[PDB]
Every structure is written in structure tokens, then in C-alpha cells.
Paper text:
Human glycolipid transfer protein (hsGLTP) forms the prototypical GLTP fold and is characterized by a broad transfer selectivity for glycosphingolipids (GSLs). In human GLTP, a glycolipid headgroup recognition centre located on the protein surface enables selective binding of the GSL head and ceramide amide groups via multiple specific interactions. Encapsulation of lipid chains within the hydrophobic pocket involves a cleft-like gating mechanism that results in two glycolipid-binding modes. To elucidate the structural dynamics of the GLTP–GSL dimer and associated adaptations, we comparatively analyzed nine novel crystal structures of wild-type GLTP (wtGLTP) and the sulfatide-specific mutants D48V and A47D/D48V complexed with N-lauroyl-containing monosulfatide (N-lauroyl-3-O-sulfo-galactosylceramide; hereafter referred to as 12:0 monoSF) and disulfatide (N-lauroyl-3,6-di-O-sulfo-galactosylceramide; hereafter referred to as 12:0 diSF) in different crystal forms and compared them with previously studied GLTP–24:1 monoSF complexes.
To elucidate the dynamics of intermolecular interactions in the GLTP–disulfatide complex, we comparatively analyzed two crystal forms of wtGLTP and two crystal forms of the D48V mutant complexed with 12:0 diSF. The crystals of the wtGLTP–disulfatide complex represent ‘open’ and ‘closed’ conformations of the dimeric arrangement. However, adaptations within the open and closed dimers necessitate slightly different overall lipid conformations. The first noticeable deviations in the surface contact areas occur in wtGLTP–disulfatide complexes, which probably indicate a slightly different mutual orientation of monomers compared with wtGLTP–monosulfatide complexes. Interestingly, ligand adaptations also emerge with wtGLTP complexes bound with disulfatide. In contrast, the 6-O-sulfo group adopts different conformations/positions that depend on the protein (wild type or D48V) or the crystal type.
Residue numbers in the entry:
A (entry chain A), B (entry chain B): 3 to 209
């Protein structure tokens, strides 16, 4: 899945380019097929959702929107007091919290975080990724959903196995494959988070 | 909403005109917006997408697919073992369940079914809806999720109002306006169901 479509390394000036960024992340939603139960299908559709809205905006004037920063700043002027709860800016605001979940989730598995009593489960890693990436932005109902949903969770091994289908590589080799992917993935997500902060564009509302 | 677009009548042969089906039902996702909670947004995604896929498979030869019945009888021949669990057929297989939920749900409200313990919840109605149209194609986890999502359900009052979009209607006038929609709506659906029975194209798998 992930380490064929590696993420371009972070540029000097820290300016992510929309087009290629979208090409790269448009590869992550099938992530969720590895999770292996159609419960998760709607999450996946939600993120694809975001990626498309961004790609739409971008496609409308690829020069005006060469970078992600260009998207945020151009929309800020363009829409109202409405901003940033509008347009691609909103799409990204959320997309990034999905990317982060993935990001923290993989890292956790990659770091031998486990439940000493039940090593082959993913609760504690999903939960930690959920704690840090989405929980702040979800009401009680939704976490009650997240909570059920954590029973569609596959076994850890079965994820990995599945997360590297065919390919042909130890569980171990598999984890390094991630550890490399994670380097740029993480650098990138952190810039996007920076960007949002510096442009007062994060919103704290819940769902 | 629901009654600026009403489903055509029913032909002498019960055959269903596809473009005027796709056109007509695609004013129904907007609906879920009326429940007033971003919880239900993914729900609508999955109907939106049912329609999309049904539509493209149509566009590709609107002569061969002039009817819904045509969709099934053609796809049936176009794959082996594959059909029914393929293409617009499967798309419509699921669409009819959402579309049924939407009917039965309203039908209930429109008939004043409620809980005397609180006639401004719609939770007994969502439930009849769900049990009758979708519960047996969902596995235990989805069902949990439904039960949780049922807590983001609005009140009957506001739900009715959100529907009205302040066309300045009275509240039992709004009920009335639905019952009208419900007529041909409840037919079309019933037919699609017969279709699917009589074609041997139902499947029973849970999710
Ligand atoms: C961040 C929160 C934490 C994570 C949350 C985890 C996710 C929770 C989501 C739970 C499930 C939501 C409901 C969606 C259910 C769908 O899976 C089902 C069946 O989906 C079908 O799957 C099929 C896949 O085929 S299969 O793998 O071989 O099965 C098809 O893809 C089909 O699309 S198609 O165009 O390709 O043909 C597709 O609809 N959809 C439904 O159940 C219909 C939903 C109608 C909802 C009605 C509203 C009820 C809600 C109550 C409102 C008060
Ligand atoms: C009949 C079946 C039972 C009924 C089913 C009930 C519904 C189940 C699904 C529950 C919800 C699933 C999770 C998604 C929740 C989303 O509402 C949130 C917010 O999403 C944003 O909502 C917004 C709505 O706007 S707002 O009202 O102004 O807020 C925007 O639409 C924005 O999209 S945008 O591109 O157009 O801009 C959109 O992402 N989505 C998330 O939190 C992202 C989820 C990330 C993936 C989670 C991965 C963890 C899953 C567990 C894995 C073990």
C-alpha cells in the first residue's frame, strides 16, 4: 500500500505543494480496507471526501493554488467572516486530523506499544491515535460510535499482513517499511498543523 | 424540501424509468441535513454514492438501460457468479433499503406513531424504520452504531421545521405535504422490491 507512493521530502521553505500532496495522500484511504471490516468503509469515504474537495478547488486554478498555504490564504480573503469554516480550508482542517490518526497509529505499532496481556489487539494504539488526533473534536455520541467501532478492529498481525499484501516480506521487514514512510509523512502533517496554527485557522468545535 | 420534486406515477407495465428515478431520488439525500447533526453526514454519503454509481452505469448506454428492470436483466447476463453482487444492481440493492427506511420512517411520523413518554422524539420511528428496512443486513457492530447514532436524532418539531425550510407552513400542513410525496414514493419502492424478489437478485449478507 503505503511505501510505493512515498511522500516528497520537505522543501527548504516548508511549502507543501497542493498537487503532488494530493496525489500522495490519495493513496491512503485504502489503508482502511486493511482494517478489514466494512464498518470502516464510511470513515474512508469521509477522508476521500476531503481530498476531493481540495482537489476540486485546486483544479479550478492550479496556479492560484499551487501550495497548501496558497489555498488557505486565498480562501481567507475570498470567503467571508465565514473562513476558515468553509471551502478547502475546512476540508484540510479535517483531512489532517485523519492523516494524523493514521500517523500516530502506525508509529505506535511501529514502536512496540502493545497491551502486555493481549499483544495481538490494536485497542491501545487506535485509542492513543484517537486520543491525540480526533477526540478533542468529537462529541460524546461520536466517541460512543468510535468506541463500538473498535470492535471491527482486526488483529495486529492480520493488519500488518494485510497492510502489505502480496509484496512479500517479514512482519519485521514490514514494520521498517512503515518506519521509513512515517519520516516524511510526519514531517508533512506537522507542517500542515503549523500552518493552521499560524493562520489562526484551527477551529475547536465538536461533532 | 420533499415536495418540490415528486416521483412520476406508475406505468401500465410497472417498468421504471431510470433517469426520472435517479433525478427524483437525488433530492433525498439533502433530507439527512434536516436531522441537524453532522453525525448523519456519512449516512447520506452512502446513499449519494449509491445514486452516483447507478447513474454512471446508466449514462454509458441510456438506451440499453432505459429502465431499472433493464439494469438488472442486462448486468445479470453481463457477469456470471458475479451478479447480483455487482454494479448498478448491487447499487440499487442497497439504495432501495435506504429508500425504504426513508419511507417507513416518515410514514410512521405522518401517522402520528410516537412515544407518549415523549412525542417530540422520533426515536421509536427511526427504530421501526431501521428494524423494518435495514437491521437484518447489518451485523452486530453496525447495529450498535445505529443505536448510538440514534441519540443524535432531533426532535419531531425541529425535524419537521428543518424540512419546511420556513416556507412559512403550518406544522400539520407539513405532515400533509409529506403524505403526498409518500404516495408514489411508497409505490416505486414496493415495485423495486418485487422486481428484486421476482428477478432472483436479492442477497442477504450482513455488514
Ligand atoms: C470518527 C468516528 C469513529 C469511526 C467510525 C467508524 C464508522 C462507523 C460507520 C458505521 C456504518 C454506517 C452505515 C453505512 C453502512 C453501509 O456499509 C451499508 C452497506 O454499504 C454498502 O456496501 C456495499 C459494499 O458491498 S459489499 O461489501 O459486498 O457489502 C456497496 O458498496 C454499497 O455501495 S455500492 O454503490 O458499491 O453498491 C454500499 O451502500 N449501507 C447501508 O446500510 C444503507 C444505509 C442507509 C442509512 C439509513 C439511515 C439510518 C440512520 C438513522 C437516522 C436517524
Ligand atoms: C444505519 C447505520 C447506523 C447509522 C449510522 C450513523 C452514522 C455512523 C457514522 C458516524 C460518523 C463517522 C465518522 C465521521 C464523522 C464526521 O462527521 C467527522 C467530521 O467530518 C467533517 O464534517 C464536516 C461537516 O462540517 S461541519 O458540520 O461544519 O462540522 C465537513 O463535511 C468535512 O468535510 S469537507 O471536506 O466537506 O469539508 C468533514 O470531514 N469526520 C471526522 O472526524 C474525520 C474522521 C477521521 C477518520 C477516523 C479513523 C478512526 C476509526 C477507527 C479505526 C480503528
Amino acid at each position: 500500500l503505503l511505501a510505493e507512493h512515498l511522500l516528497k521530502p520537505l522543501p527548504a521553505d516548508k511549502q507543501i505543494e497542493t498537487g503532488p500532496f494530493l496525489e500522495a495522500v490519495s493513496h491512503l484511504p485504502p489503508f482502511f480496507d486493511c482494517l478489514g471490516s466494512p464498518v470502516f468503509t464510511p470513515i474512508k469515504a469521509d477522508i476521500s471526501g476531503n481530498i476531493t474537495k481540495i482537489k476540486a478547488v485546486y483544479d479550478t486554478n492550479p496556479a492560484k493554488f499551487r501550495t497548501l498555504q496558497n489555498i488557505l490564504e486565498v480562501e481567507k480573503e475570498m470567503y467571508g467572516a465565514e473562513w476558515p469554516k468553509v471551502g478547502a480550508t475546512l476540508a484540510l482542517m479535517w483531512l489532517k486530523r485523519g492523516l494524523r490518526f493514521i500517523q500516530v497509529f502506525l508509529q505506535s505499532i511501529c514502536d512496540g506499544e502493545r497491551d502486555e496481556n493481549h499483544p495481538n489487539l490494536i485497542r491501545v494504539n487506535a485509542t492513543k491515535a484517537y486520543e491525540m488526533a480526533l477526540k478533542k473534536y468529537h462529541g460524546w455520541i461520536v466517541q460512543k460510535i468510535f468506541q463500538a467501532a473498535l470492535y471491527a478492529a482486526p488483529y495486529k498481525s492480520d493488519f500488518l499482513k494485510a497492510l502489505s499484501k502480496g509484496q512479500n516480506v517479514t512482519e519485521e521487514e514490514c514494520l521498517e517499511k512503515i518506519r521509513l514512510f512515517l519520516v516524511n509523512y510526519t514531517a508533512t502533517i506537522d507542517v500542515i498543523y503549523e500552518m493552521y496554527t499560524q493562520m489562526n485557522a484551527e477551529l475547536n468545535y465538536k461533532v
